[PDB]
Amino acid sequence: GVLKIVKVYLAVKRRIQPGDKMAGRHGNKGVISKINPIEDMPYDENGTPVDIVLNPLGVPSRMNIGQILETHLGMAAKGIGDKINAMLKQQQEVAKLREFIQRAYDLGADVRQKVDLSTFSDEEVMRLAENLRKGMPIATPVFDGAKEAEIKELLKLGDLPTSGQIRLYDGRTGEQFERPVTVGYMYMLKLNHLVDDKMHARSTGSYSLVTQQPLGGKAQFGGQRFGEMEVWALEAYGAAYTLQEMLTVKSDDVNGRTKMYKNIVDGNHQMEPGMPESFNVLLKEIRSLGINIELEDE
Amino acid sequence: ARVTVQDAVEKIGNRFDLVLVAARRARQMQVGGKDPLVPEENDKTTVIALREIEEGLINNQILDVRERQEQQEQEAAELQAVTAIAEGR
Amino acid sequence: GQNMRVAFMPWNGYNFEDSILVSERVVQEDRFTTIHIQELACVSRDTKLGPEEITADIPNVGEAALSKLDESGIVYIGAEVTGGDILVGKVTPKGETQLTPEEKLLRAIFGEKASDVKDSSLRVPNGVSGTVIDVQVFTRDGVEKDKRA
Amino acid sequence: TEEFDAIKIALASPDMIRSWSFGEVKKPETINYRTFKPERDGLFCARIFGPVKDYECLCGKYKRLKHRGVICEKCGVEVTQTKVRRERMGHIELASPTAHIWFLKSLPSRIGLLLDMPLRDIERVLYFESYVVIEGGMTNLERQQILTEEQYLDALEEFGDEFDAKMGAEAIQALLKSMDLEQECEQLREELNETNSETKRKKLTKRIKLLEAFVQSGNKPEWMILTVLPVLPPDLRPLVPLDGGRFATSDLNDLYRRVINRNNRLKRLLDLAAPDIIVRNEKRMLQEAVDALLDNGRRGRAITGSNKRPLKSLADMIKGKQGRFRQNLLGKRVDYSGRSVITVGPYLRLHQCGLPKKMALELFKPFIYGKLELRGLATTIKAAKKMVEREEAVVWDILDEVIREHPVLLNRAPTLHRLGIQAFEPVLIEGKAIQLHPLVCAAYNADFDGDQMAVHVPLTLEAQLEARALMMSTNNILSPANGEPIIVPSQDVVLGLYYMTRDCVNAKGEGMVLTGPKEAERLYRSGLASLHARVKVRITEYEKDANGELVAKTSLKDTTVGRAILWMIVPKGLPYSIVNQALGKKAISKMLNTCYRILGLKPTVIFADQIMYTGFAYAARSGASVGIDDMVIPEKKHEIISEAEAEVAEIQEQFQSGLVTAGERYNKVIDIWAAANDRVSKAMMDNLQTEVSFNSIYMMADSGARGSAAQIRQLAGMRGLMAKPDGSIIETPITANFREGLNVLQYFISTHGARKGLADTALKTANSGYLTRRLVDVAQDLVVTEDDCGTHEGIMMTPVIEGGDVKEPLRDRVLGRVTAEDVLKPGTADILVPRNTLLHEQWCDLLEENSVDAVKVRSVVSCDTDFGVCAHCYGRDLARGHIINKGEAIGVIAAQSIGEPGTQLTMRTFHIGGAASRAAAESSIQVKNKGSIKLSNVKSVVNSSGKLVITSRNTELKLIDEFGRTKESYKVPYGAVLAKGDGEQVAGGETVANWDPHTMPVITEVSGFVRFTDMIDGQTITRQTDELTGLSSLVVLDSAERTAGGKDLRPALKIVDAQGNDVLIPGTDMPAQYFLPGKAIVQLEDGVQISSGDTLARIPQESGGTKDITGGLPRVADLFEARRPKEPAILAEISGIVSFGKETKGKRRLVITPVDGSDPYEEMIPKWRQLNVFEGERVERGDVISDGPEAPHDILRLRGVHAVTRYIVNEVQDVYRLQGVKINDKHIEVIVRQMLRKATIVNAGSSDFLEGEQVEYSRVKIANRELEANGKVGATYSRDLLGITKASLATESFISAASFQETTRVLTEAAVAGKRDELRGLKENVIVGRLIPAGTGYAYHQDRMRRRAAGEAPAAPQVTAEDA
Amino acid sequence: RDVHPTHYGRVCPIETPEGPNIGLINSLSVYAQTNEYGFLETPYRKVTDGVVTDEIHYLSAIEEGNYVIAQANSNLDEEGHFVEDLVTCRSKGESSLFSR
Ligand SMILES: [Zn+2]
Ligand SMILES: [Zn+2]
């Protein structure tokens, strides 16, 4: 640039507000509706209210059963593979846990394949937790990993529900929730906010030179366009004054934006739409030519 | 929806006409002063004109009040001003 | 992303098509609070009356506007700015057409730098309100290293 | 003020220009950069236009308010508001007038046809160049003939007069003034018809459609030459600097400064001398200047220094040469608007909307000021402009007090139909997203992933009130397209109610039906507390509905309460319970249709809020959560798969041995897998509806919500098959599914068909207003203006059965359309005088389809009203359910209902892609049920073989019972034998038809004698021997096996009587001459008597078909835009007898014998086109002969008017009816008339034959002359079918057709003709900036309001009038 | 835009952006890599007889059709034995059952 340039970077804490779009890793893209308090929202029998609620109807239409498999994998994660690193690893650290893990493990998982805390010692279990250290939250490949038979078996090894679904309670009523539901911990993801996400508020800004169409920029936000598609909309309805001022008093017409504002601030209605700027400019572009357009009365 | 829209619609020969009546009624409602329905039970909160038309009192015609000579809708305007005390600009 | 408690169930109209309902605890804690950075460049070009200047001397403003600004027009680092506060202290001359016979007399008496320039600084866009994290420093040698550098 | 009746466009005359303009501009003097005051006497002057400042004078003698009216003495100038300089105009008296490039470059030369000169040559020769053309005078006899340089004639006298020899645009004037129009009209009407020469009749017939244009009410051609150049408004072209050093000025300020400088010098070369080699050099520079304001690029574009961009000319601002046209209609940036993410609003009703609070602080600021001075928030209007203009919290209250009764308008960018912009009551909601009503989400084709909708704010109260009774969403519950509501409970809402009204069934043995019997109630009463009868079973016994829920709460009862609680809560907020009881899953949309009809509009409003709340409420009370185990796998799955994997192994082994060949081994492997998916899919549908009726994933697919019988199969059982991107199906099916482990192979295969779908809407989301544009710009001039017309002319007969989507469908076409006359068909029902029939009426016309062959119904295509359209011929469609109202744009609501469904259509290639179908037939028709046999269009006759053989193809063979209902559908070929005739009763399981699936016997239809014609041994016939017959007879050779010279010879058995004369086929005048194809079997002698039904020839082999069918979006644009189909079918130019000429494997022929000719009428038929024509009965003119589409142009010239308006509107629906979209015929015919509004009459009445004018003006001329009196004149005419891109290209209005890229040929037509443009349409009314005629614009709606008090009051003034 | 059967293990047939462009871009897969002269060569574990070797080799798109390559969805204990003699294997577009 020329004559120095001062670039100030502004940082605003973008909290989670109505309008933000979030989605997981299956394709279930959605946008936050209303931030409902922890009051109305349901909750388990052991507290821990539900954080995020989705729509089960997004499965029949949107073929993505995979997202549900992750749900059963998140809830039962306290008894599948993470159990080996959430109990057998914590028992070696705290001496007040080694007395609970060795007993509460066999009662849940009696599989010969799994590590028997009762048989193996402190040294044995240690090395049996290094073979799967990288895969802390279990491990599942792409097209060759989990299975309908393997999963179900791994759900009966740890706490707590059976088969998957579990009986909850309504946050509003509080009574027994008719028939269990599928719950757990799904890994979702928040999507960044583009410049377009920033609210575009405009009422009275600057206008162009050749045309009387409002133009935004730095301070004043750009006005929304009213394409022909939107024109045929109001054109369809019986409304006449609505679409009339739409391309007159609103935008182009210069003598319209002035009288209108001076009338609303008084308390009365705005004077009937006279001659739009579009009617003037266009008309003048004809007189200069060989042809001529002139308005005629009754 | 809106109160008695059906009954309102029935009140007029043409849908588009009912809109013209209410609009014109709203116009006079502000300018001259206020309306025919008030004391016993009228609207509540802050509100608008259709409530009147739903009622029997109003009369909307093609040319209900005019003038003998020349087309002057204006005679109506004069009488209204004389009668209605609240004044607009 | 993160790991939260999910419970698939048609709540009450909200989760119609592709909607998402989250507890009020999500806003009470900065678990989804991300950092956004916007760049507002301000360039001063040559005016018909002469090159523009970058100083804190900007009329037609309040005290809280020039308060966060230094003696060069550029706001310090770590200012709790908001919608209306000045970020860049840029000035721009007016013109003989925009000048009045009253401010023309004092122009050749109390000095040229009295009432020749007007107000034309960069402010904060309506709606957004954050803080300054990084300021840009530049000073051309041909324009002399003033109080800025 | 008064309502604008109509505007008129015409050429500006010199005297007319000096009427609005004052003074005269001589020098290009603008305004300085210092002072804004006028400089000299140029485009900016105080005297000419007006001052600039307040009341001060240019000089400075008097500025005080002392002298406001009286002007100065030294310099008298009347000072007024600077606003006067805007409206006031000025003119520039040009020396030598110039021409307009619009009336020159245009193909239809306005001066080339009128004046006998080269329509393009001479133009670009005398204007710009120096080629002199004599005007007139007493010099040179050549008044029309032009000359050059050496051909310049001069007076060879001692003292001759001055020669008026000019060139360019100034010369054209006299040439036009020397041509008498009247003299060119009288000789015109004679030359065309009289003279036999076709060289002269084709030259004057074209130069007349413009000649009479000036003779009529239109102005004279002597106004096309621009003599005076009007200036451009001062303030319209400011010179204020932008930012820094860059300037933003119009491209006109650099053009007008050029024209003037090239004018004041020309004046000096007029009064004095005017040499041909001096004046030319002057206008040569002036012409190039004025052309800059006209058009740049048609010859020489004007570029700027170091910039290849032609200056934006005045005309370039309309047509958009640089491409600004796509930005002009892109959308005018509204001052009051916004945009943000959308969301769902449950508690939010259809009457309100949930918009942000901070957004209201900006847009709604004007309504705040006028409310602040009432309270203590703000003091004055001025001081309030620096407080509520930004972040303020004191306004939160006052602002909400204004949003009490002032709804706004929501809108999505892709606006298809009318529901693109609805009105809702704003509600202050925290956040940034806008709450959109769930039911309304159906109107807007979008989801909630990131889509953003705008929002506007009604200013005036007039446009605010009409936005709550005609614009509000809850008001228009019915779609413009059909009578089916768009807004309707979709998923989460219907899921709650569905789960409620269900009955669970588990372990049950004894039949428990307590509802009715008396012993059952007691028996299963104590059994409930026992161990036998369970609780979750079928049992109903108690008192009322309210008391029933009381028991169901104590774990005593379960069901029989959900149906009771829902049958009292809903009808609580709204009476009429007789109708309120049908919810279901498919009746969820039928309810919003039946409630409005019986009840009203208001009742429906609150009726939608009730179902909404309880719709999502019980949706959580039940919890229809979907899981992995919810996808119950059929136990019959592993069995079908095993049997499938064991079948493919056997086939492979049979190929190694020698059993199979290469045909039965392909269709066997693909078949066992093409059905394996269907079996396992249905295995789960009938397993859950008997074991567990309360399955989440199942119920959410069974009811409404979102579920398909194809997407569930994939996840549940196995995903059938996946085809390649091309179309060829893969021979390697996929077994693994979504549930189990899906390998990398099968996942890759499904990707092929997954790329198409998402790649389709990719180009539609960019500009969905492309398809709609082609339709809206066409029928935008259709406005409702019904005045008890009742035209019974051009009646359109509705065929009892549609054309044929496939080969023999069965549907009806009549909905909400008024009948033409009194038709009596039903045994009880009876449509009297023209009355708007309902939806239940069409079922009646469809019932007795075996009696009626044509339904009399008034159509839109045939209406008396020219511009607008009556209400009768139209229908009920509008915005509600009642009859169509006056003042409606039935043209924009019809075009928008076609472009919207076009987004769901398949987009491959505009010129048709292709498909894959198989042709099969069976020679066995065994009736299933009982009844009689119905036959249509068939000529049965008994032959000598004792067989009831028919003589026609495409026979409707269906089983019509005693109630008249279609139960069966068969296709009877040609030469088939029917066991029983028409009307004869039949029994169940009885053969009623039997033919040979190998031979197509060529049977005659008349009796007499056989005569060998055009058959000589060694030329066309040769002694051959069959393979099945064994009898040696004469066999006709092939077309390729024939000798040289026998290429024109065509063998045939011409049938003659006893007198030797020709025998005509009954019904028409078609000689009986059946041609004998090659390799035919002729087992008949010569001169031997025969009878009707006797076989002549035989066709050993049969073939044809394979590739055909179009369908999809591409075809849509192919119909509206009449073009050349992918598989053109050669229609029949003449209607008569039909008989194949050849049958050779190479080429097949088809010959028709009208009257005199026969052989010349040969039609080549390849092996691709499937023969749909027979060899007997007479086929209609324009009938389909091949298996493919037809040409709207050719078919129009053949059949008649009752075809095009019944075919182009039918073939289009055959695409939407497939996807599920139902569109009424009303919103399809209104656009068809426009493609036919132009035609060419054959019998001249007022104008000549070749004109190509409109048909509306030609319909009235023949109406008053015939119907009324004054010698009925037969003003017959011929239809003319065009495209939507051409029919709209040349319309009556000039602003309507200006929406294309040809704004040069249009504007000139409506100008030279002096046509009065009565703004009827709405699209042509928005651009001008007038008031929409639909409103309320309609003249019809003039009306004032009264109060009783006000009513007595005028009486008081009337009373005063009486004199004493 | 439509992925071809030959594009196996060299590019993900479902990694194209969602919006204005669908199938016009599509990123590059994992193990796939631009070798020397354009020809994309995806790694393949050379397995001799019934013993799988841990060595990797980059085969050309035209060389792959010359040899039969097994799949990854096959059961393997370690790297010296094979589960079943007959296991689903793929060639260059077709599917057949080959032995170890
Ligand atoms: Zn003066
Ligand atoms: Zn009609």
Numbering used by the authors:
A (entry chain C): 1045 to 1342
B (entry chain E): 2 to 90
C (entry chain C): 797 to 945
D (entry chain D): 14 to 704, 717 to 1389
E (entry chain C): 548 to 647
Give sentences copied directly from the paper behind this entry.
We generated a single-particle cryo-EM (spEM) reconstruction of Eco RNAP by analyzing ∼42,000 images of Eco RNAP particles preserved in vitreous ice. Final refinement of image orientation parameters by projection matching yielded a structure of Eco RNAP with a 0.5 Fourier-shell cutoff resolution of ∼11.2 Å. Although the cryo-EM grids were prepared with samples of Eco RNAP holoenzyme (core RNAP plus the promoter-specificity σ70 subunit), the σ70 subunit apparently dissociated during grid preparation as density corresponding to σ70 was completely absent. The spEM reconstruction showed Eco core RNAP in a conformation similar to that observed in Thermus X-ray structures but with clear density corresponding to βi4, βi11, and β'i6. The crystal structures of Eco β2-βi4 and βflap-βi9 were spliced into the resulting homology model by superimposition of the overlapping β2 and βflap domains, respectively. The spEM map contained clear density corresponding to βi4, but density for βi9 was absent. In addition, extra density not accounted for by the homology model was present for βi11 and β'i6. An ab initio predicted structure of the short βi11 (see below) was placed into the corresponding density to fill in the gap in the Eco β sequence between 1121 and 1181. Flexible-fitting of the final Eco RNAP model (excluding ω, the C-terminal 41 residues of β', and βi9) into the spEM map was performed using YUP.SCX, resulting in a superb fit of the conserved RNAP as well as of the lineage-specific inserts (excluding βi9). In order to position βi9 in the context of the entire RNAP structure, we used our previously determined helical cryo-EM map of Eco core RNAP (hEM) and fit of the Taq core RNAP X-ray crystal structure since the hEM map contains strong density for βi9. The Eco core RNAP model was completed by adding back the C-terminal segment of β' as well as ω (in accordance with the Thermus RNAP structures).
